[PDB]
Symmetry: D3
Amino acid sequence: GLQRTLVLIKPDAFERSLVAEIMGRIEKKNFKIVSMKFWSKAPRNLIEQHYKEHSEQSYFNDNCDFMVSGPIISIVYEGTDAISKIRRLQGNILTPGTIRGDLANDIRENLIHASDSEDSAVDEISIWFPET
Amino acid sequence: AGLQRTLVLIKPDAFERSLVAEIMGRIEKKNFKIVSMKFWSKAPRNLIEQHYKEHSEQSYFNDNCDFMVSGPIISIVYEGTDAISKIRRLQGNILTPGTIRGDLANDIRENLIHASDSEDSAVDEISIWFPET
Amino acid sequence: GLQRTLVLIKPDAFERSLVAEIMGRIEKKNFKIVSMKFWSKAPRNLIEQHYKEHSEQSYFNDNCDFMVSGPIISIVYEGTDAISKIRRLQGNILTPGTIRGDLANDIRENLIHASDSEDSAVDEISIWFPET
Amino acid sequence: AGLQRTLVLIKPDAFERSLVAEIMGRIEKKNFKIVSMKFWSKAPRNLIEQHYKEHSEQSYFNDNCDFMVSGPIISIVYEGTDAISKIRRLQGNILTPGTIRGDLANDIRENLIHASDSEDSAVDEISIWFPET
Amino acid sequence: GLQRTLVLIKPDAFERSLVAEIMGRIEKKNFKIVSMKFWSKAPRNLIEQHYKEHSEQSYFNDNCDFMVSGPIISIVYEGTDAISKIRRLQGNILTPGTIRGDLANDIRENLIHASDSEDSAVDEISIWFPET
Amino acid sequence: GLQRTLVLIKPDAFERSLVAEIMGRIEKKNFKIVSMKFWSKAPRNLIEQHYKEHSEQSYFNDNCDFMVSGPIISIVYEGTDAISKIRRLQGNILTPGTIRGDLANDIRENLIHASDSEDSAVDEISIWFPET
Ligand SMILES: O=c1ccn([C@@H]2O[C@H](COP(=O)(O)OP(=O)(O)O)[C@@H](O)[C@H]2O)c(=O)[nH]1
Ligand SMILES: O=c1ccn([C@@H]2O[C@H](COP(=O)(O)OP(=O)(O)O)[C@@H](O)[C@H]2O)c(=O)[nH]1
Ligand SMILES: O=c1ccn([C@@H]2O[C@H](COP(=O)(O)OP(=O)(O)O)[C@@H](O)[C@H]2O)c(=O)[nH]1
Ligand SMILES: O=c1ccn([C@@H]2O[C@H](COP(=O)(O)OP(=O)(O)O)[C@@H](O)[C@H]2O)c(=O)[nH]1
Ligand SMILES: O=c1ccn([C@@H]2O[C@H](COP(=O)(O)OP(=O)(O)O)[C@@H](O)[C@H]2O)c(=O)[nH]1
Ligand SMILES: O=c1ccn([C@@H]2O[C@H](COP(=O)(O)OP(=O)(O)O)[C@@H](O)[C@H]2O)c(=O)[nH]1
Ligand SMILES: [Mg+2]
Ligand SMILES: [Mg+2]
Ligand SMILES: [Mg+2]
Ligand SMILES: [Mg+2]
Ligand SMILES: [Mg+2]
Ligand SMILES: [Mg+2]
């Protein structure tokens, strides 16, 4: 049944004016906002926690710098099968019909983060909304 | 030529969520044309049970009929090249973004739209909804 | 409070594929369909009844011929102040933001008819939906 | 330069009707930028009564506060040239198609969005919603 | 009442990815493209000619600079009452429902030029499309 | 991985008023116009060259006729992995989410051509934009 998932709207969505576009696509699939924060600039330690599984990758520091280059919005979304369905909505830059498929064309600057599992979800929600 | 007719139901959840034009617009933009259309403020359960007769022995059969009579429905006959299979692809499923259910639905039951899935289904569903054959 | 109004989607909306576009705009303003009929070709006497107040005008026969040149949809819409609000949504070809303002550019071929008063509404609903 | 900040509330009827992104998108497309934003699953009535204090003596005052706490709200500080008056025009009213209320709302109470109507209103409403001035 | 009119799509439209959005609003109102040129950077002479009437105004030089800061598209559009209609479609940054009304918020960067009279239309068409 | 690719917007897009819709989908994916020509009626030679690989197929002549039955736009687009990405955006009349997937239902009238390889892209760019 109901799941909650963590979504980040990335700084490129703000620069390109696609924040409502991305949010609108999740809204139209009937997912509801449980929690939301706007960060004019997200603290670097939060981004590094969020991406900690990536700490050894070559792209790690650069992606963090990107994630801190403009605003982000963190959202907890709720709905039936939210984790997997919001992941599919995110998609990838090769898959038309998805957010990244229609609107992104970059390895790094790809508009949206969504939790990919139950464990990452629980962990990511606790990073951005620790009051709970 | 390659011309076919198919049957589409707009389900009560579409009226509930104000998605009726969005769904029809998606079919319209693919160049399919309305041939007949009826608005049912509430559909006779008899008609629903016929429409879903192949499903009469499943657990979900009664809950679904219930939902199907819980608000309005629109039944539409559409026409165009390869209409049955193309409108079916448009309908898609709740897992495939880009399709109607993919973009707009999130439930096994409340899924906004029905399209005929074969030439045989279409003839039969059209007969159910537009008996004036 | 609640009113009902009569709407015709005209044959030019079918030819130009704007049926859902027009209907969508009324839907987004929170008006509900009470009754609807599709007419592959509307009987001429219905069109002539519908436009009877116009019977002496120079455009009368030509407009009827147009109205019979392709399909029409007649709809009874319900909502708060439906007559006047749907009229304003229809607008005219000079008023951006309205249906005719955004999508039409013709004296005759103007996509949509809406009832303009309580009396015309009651009368027009009885023409297209006489079962009541 | 001509830079201003304004306060916008997305009302509970927007969440109800799934119009939140549509409204925000209309402000986004006019090139206004979010400066601060908060999501309230339910807003303290105290905050609403302050926000609508100039209205405390009207018949509709209590019914409106009721509605304002009947579901979520988002409060947003927007920034851009002439932001107060331009976002106010975007909001418009239920009689003017082309504006947010014009296209999407049909009620005197449930009207989807509030925008500050003056420089004085904005400073005060921003203070209410984002007391961390 | 068939007319042709000249439209310029300004560099801010390319910057903000609003090109198709703007052209679509004109298309949806049933106007047709009669000719079109894409300029990666317009010759400054063309811009000075185009805004000649404004050569004495204080914003003239900055505006010319703006108009050469990115690509522009020059379009000749045709349709009934095209000059007046496309001008209304263009609108102003105050009134919603128009291109500028919905999408612009600046006295200089306002996305679209449209001819405002029969004379300026003849003139501007000859500036951008001299081959007639 | 910056590439240029050639896109043709076909006469059925003008007929159905889908020009901006199609161009917008490419724009929204962050591809840029590098050059563009509008042809009220393309020289048949250009069309024959363009579809040379198909000169032996049964649909060759009808297709050439179709391609000259109304306006076309030829566009050179640039961006990361542009040839492959715009091809996917183009898609096919079976799979929703693409231009053809959403908007076309014909084996001939399918709205958009996009180059399918590095070689055809060089070639087709030289056909429509010989000045390089
Ligand atoms: O080569 C890469 C791979 C990933 N990323 C960034 O790091 C994030 C997480 O990487 P992952 O491969 O898990 O992508 P995702 O799960 O978000 O699709 C991506 O979304 C990118 O923004 C990057 O900058 N370079
Ligand atoms: O577990 C289920 C499966 C089916 N349905 C309903 O019954 C219809 C027919 O079921 P089917 O599996 O054939 O789905 P469809 O072909 O419509 O995609 C569906 O559209 C649902 O509305 C349901 O309520 N519960
Ligand atoms: O000169 C005219 C005036 C009107 N009409 C048609 O007749 C309808 C009714 O005329 P009216 O002036 O009442 O326009 P409306 O009330 O629909 O705005 C219009 O919508 C047009 O389709 C026409 O063909 N020629
Ligand atoms: O008769 C009324 C008038 C006002 N309102 C509510 O109170 C708010 C403030 O009223 P106002 O007349 O100032 O409208 P606004 O400035 O918001 O357009 C409105 O947005 C409505 O939500 C109401 O419920 N009933
Ligand atoms: O104070 C001003 C007024 C005008 N303009 C620019 O000059 C153009 C022509 O000015 P005009 O007042 O004629 O505007 P328009 O007729 O295009 O609305 C405008 O579109 C703006 O881009 C400007 O830069 N500063
Ligand atoms: O049976 C056919 C197949 C192709 N075409 C046309 O010829 C073009 C090139 O054919 P191809 O199979 O290469 O299609 P594409 O690569 O563009 O998908 C298509 O876009 C169609 O417009 C046609 O008219 N009849
Ligand atoms: Mg990952
Ligand atoms: Mg089935
Ligand atoms: Mg009238
Ligand atoms: Mg007020
Ligand atoms: Mg001027
Ligand atoms: Mg090919």
